[PDB]
Amino acid sequence: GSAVQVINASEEHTFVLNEDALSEVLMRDEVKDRFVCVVSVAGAFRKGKSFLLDFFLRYMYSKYVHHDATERDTTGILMWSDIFLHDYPNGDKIAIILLDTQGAFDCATVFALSTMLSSVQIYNLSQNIQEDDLQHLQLFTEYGRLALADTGKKPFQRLQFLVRDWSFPYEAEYGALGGDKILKRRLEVSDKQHPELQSLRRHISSCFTEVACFLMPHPGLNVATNPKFDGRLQDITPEFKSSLRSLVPMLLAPDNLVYKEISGQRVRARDLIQYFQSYMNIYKGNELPEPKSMLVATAEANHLTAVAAAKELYGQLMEEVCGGTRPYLSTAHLQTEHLRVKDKALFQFAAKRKMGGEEFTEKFRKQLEDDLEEVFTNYQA
Ligand SMILES: Nc1nc2c(ncn2[C@@H]2O[C@H](COP(=O)(O)OP(=O)(O)O)[C@@H](O)[C@H]2O)c(=O)[nH]1
Ligand SMILES: [Mg+2]
Secondary structure, three states: OOOOEEEOEOOOOOOOEOHHHHHHHHOOOOOOOOOOOEEEEEOOOOOOHHHHHHHHHOOOHHHHHOOOOOOOOOOOOEEEOOOOOOOOOOOOOOOOEEEEOOOOOOOOOOOOHHHHOOOEEEEEEEOOOOHHHHHOOHHHHOHHHHHHHHOOOOOOOEEEEEEEEEOOOOOOOOOHHHHHHHHHHOOOHHHOOOOOOOOOOOOOHHHOOEEEEEEEEOOOHHHHOOOOOOOOOOOOOHHHHHHHHHHHHHHOOOOOOOOOEEOOEEOOOOOHHHHHHHHOOOOOOOOOOOOOOOHHHHHHHHHHHHHHHHHHHHHOOHHHHOOOOOOOOOOOOHHHHHHHHHHHHHHOOOOOOOOOOOOOOOHHHHHHHHHHOOOOOOOOO
16 A cells, blocks of 8 residues: 555564664655654553554644545554655654554563654553553653763653543543643642652653653444454544544644654664664573663664764765775875864764763774774775
């Protein structure tokens, strides 16, 4: 059809990455600018995830495109082949990504990826915001708390508690007005004497730019209880549809378009392909052990990305000004000219600022020099 959803990982029995696959799309000339949205939905299998998404399209394909008319046996996460570009004026230039968790679910421990990798997380919850649901949000409030000391800047931007089939609008009215009555409660109250480490209601704010909750009307017994739905639009309750119209926009079009911001700085799309394979290593270990750091893995991709960011620059400053149509023959101070570009590759490397440590970071520029300086010791003399 018009577009497909590409797998990124599998599971049974290992936990492969489809490196090419992810790469075979992000690298399209949406190589940029600003990965960003990066909107994801996750949570309870068949609490209607891959459906809220399916309206994210049949209602986005038409504010970015035609402005009027017109995981079967594997987990991992989805990406739609289509991607939604923008913008100007003071932008950006922004690609738009949709991920839809799925597959081996029986929240099935692949909500961290789909959150580590996301500028807008939609925790797709049912009935109520329970405590168990609140307990899956631990391994970030610590991971980030470190980072809070470390980077100094809150990782994670927006988490959207989405309550599907909320059923007492008389206490709290459907939508954002009541999303933030219910939420505010359940992060007061049982912060008072009741649970132990889930008392991370105290740390949450710090680790997210925006945390907000939304309450959905039950759609209807006919959608809820039917195998392979289509019917018609009437077949859905008006209360649902009226909510979408407040929902989907609320999230989409800028500035509800949320900038993916590692360290404290936006990121292009060509760098996701890094962050994707980086985390994914220390997930089920790549060997055995987890988690909390995490901060090892984020920094180590926070960093190796600037290397490849300031190595592309090297060539694309050297073999043009210092080579190519006037090639590889002595001057004898192309060296002097190469020092310049090497310097540029370091003087303009320290873009300010990534993160990871001190002896941990500069470890890399040690290997920029020794990987930059390996053209001075070249090529065929
Ligand atoms: N109760 C309820 N059911 C829904 C809602 N939205 C979709 N469904 C039903 O959920 C099923 C599909 O869920 P789906 O998104 O594919 O599974 P998931 O991706 O794993 O969450 C179908 O029966 C839909 O009728 C909702 O808001 N409430
Ligand atoms: Mg699904």
